[PDB]
Paper text:
Mice transgenic for human mutant P301S tau are widely used as models for human tauopathies. They develop neurodegeneration and abundant filamentous inclusions made of human mutant four-repeat tau. Here we report the electron cryo-microscopy (cryo-EM) structures of tau filaments from the brains of Tg2541 and PS19 mice transgenic for human P301S tau. However, the structures of tau filaments from mouse lines Tg2541 and PS19 share a substructure at the junction of R2 and R3, which comprises residues I297-V312.
The filament core from the cerebral cortex of 48-week-old mice from line PS19 extends from residues G271-P364 of tau and consists of the C-terminal four residues of R1, the whole of R2 and R3 and 28 N-terminal residues of R4. The four-layered ‘head’, which is made of β﻿2-β﻿5, consists of the nine C-terminal residues of R2 and the whole of R3. The ‘tail’ is two-layered, with one layer consisting of β﻿1 that is made of the rest of R2 and a small portion of R1, whereas the other layer consists of β﻿6-β﻿8 and is formed by 28 residues of R4. A large external density is found next to K290 and the adjacent Q288. In the PS19 fold, these lysine residues are located on different sides of the main chain, with K298 making a salt bridge with D295 that turns the preceding N-terminal residues in a different direction. K281, K317 and K321 co-ordinate the second additional density in the Tg2541 fold; it makes a right angle turn between strands β﻿1 and bβ﻿, whereas in the PS19 fold, K281 is in the middle of the long β﻿1 strand, where it is buried alongside D283, K343, D345 and D348, in the interface with R4 strands β﻿6 and β﻿7. The secondary structure of segment R4 of the PS19 fold is consistent with the β﻿-hairpin that we propose to account for either island of the Tg2541 fold.
Residue numbers in the entry:
A (entry chain A), B (entry chain B), C (entry chain C): 271 to 364
The structure:
């Protein structure tokens, strides 16, 4: 009869991290220092008129809509340890 | 008869982190220093008129609608330990 | 009967990190120092008119919509250890 000692330390990380971002989009970021006119899909006798006069001390600084998609998995100071002080395995079979 | 000692320390992380962001969108961020005119899908004799006069000391700083999608899984100072002080496994089979 | 001692320290990292970003888009970032006119898919007798006069001290600094997609998996100070102080394996079979 032999004395068996077994110690095991496993760590499996089955990780799947994804970050998808689709956009079917029209027009989006349109910016005009003076007048801006937008006409989406006019039909038949669709009269659209804009009038504007003079253009003086104008500041126009559009900061816009930032889109951000993220997906993180983080392990900070993870530890899987096994401290076996003073191990001994004696077999004595006369 | 052999003395068996077994120690096991496992840690399985079956993780799935996702972050999806779709947008089917029209027009979105439209900015005009003077007049802005938008006409979506006019039909038949749809008269639309805008008039504006003069343009002086104008500031126009549109900060807009930021979109953010996130998905985190974090493990801070995780610990799976097994402290076995002074282990001993003796077999004595005359 | 022989005394067996076994120590195992495994660490499996089955990782899958992805970051997809599609965009079927029209027009997007359009910027005009004076007037901006956009007409999407006009049909039939779709009269669209814009008028503007004069263009003075104009600043026009469009900061726009930054899109960012990210996906991180990070392991900071990960540790899978096995400290076996003073190991001994004696076999005594007269």
């Amino acid at each position: 009869g032999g004395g068996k000692v077994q110690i095991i330390n496993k760590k499996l990380d089955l990780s799947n991290v994804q970050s998808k971002c689709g956009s079917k989009d029209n027009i989006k970021h349109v910016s005009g220092g003076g007048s801006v006119q937008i006409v989406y899909k006019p039909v038949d006798l669709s009269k659209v008129t804009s009038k504007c006069g003079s253009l003086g001390n104008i500041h126009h600084k559009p900061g816009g809509g930032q889109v951000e998609v993220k997906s993180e998995k983080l392990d900070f100071k993870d530890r899987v340890q096994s401290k076996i002080g003073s191990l001994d395995n004696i077999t004595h079979v006369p």
